[PDB]
Amino acid sequence: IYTAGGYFRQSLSYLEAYNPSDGTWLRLADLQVPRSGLAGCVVGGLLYAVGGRNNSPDGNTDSSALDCYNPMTNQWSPCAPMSVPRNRIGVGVIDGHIYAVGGSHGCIHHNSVERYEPERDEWHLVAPMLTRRIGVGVAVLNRLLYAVGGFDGTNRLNSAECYYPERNEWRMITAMNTIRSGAGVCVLHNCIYAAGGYDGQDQLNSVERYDVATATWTFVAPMKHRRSALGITVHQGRIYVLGGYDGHTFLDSVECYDPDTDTWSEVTRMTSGRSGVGVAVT
């Protein structure tokens, strides 16, 4: 479990790895620009950091950057930047290709989406979403791209839509039961999970999951601690959520979801509390 970037009074350069077996934290090479509100993913075994923002005492620069971490070089390397800066981006990987979804640049909330090819180092625009979405959760299932929740600049969203690559088109699907911006969104086997987030009034601990075969969202066991802007990933068939903000403190808590008994429990404590991280596994 690798977490990159994040926010704790300023955007951070931390790259750290958590081990669910031995429970100890590995501290690794720093990002070559601090970022929060970024997304992380893995392609070809290399970890990509996508978008985000450097919120510092001397600036607040939205990031168009794409950069590559190699787990046995302990080295970061820059890749081609995106069309636009995307703070609070979501990403998903189809066929080893990078889809960058939504996010913001200043007051502009993107509905734009663009595709990166790792072995060509190229971005190009695809069809935009039906909705402008920042803090969108993104997941991939059955070679389809799902954009879930988010914020359009005015309303926070329970809607979700689906991208079909070979038709270049977005399809609205059944909305979530809960409005969520900055939730953790991932696949645990074959339910698209949406955990936590912010509905414009409170940070959430509720978790719900989408069943494609019935096009139904159903609620499962909620987290122990409400959290928004959390990282999320699935390891060994279990879901891990990392940090976030609960309206009062930047959480270092990390929770595990065991799907077969449907319970959450405290697994570990991050080295420092933070929100807005990028998380991925390799």
Binding site: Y7, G37, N55, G182, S228, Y245, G276
Partner: peptide
């Protein structure tokens, strides 16, 4: 600086 992310 906002309730969703803490920033």
């Amino acid at each position: 600086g906002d309730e969703e992310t803490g920033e």
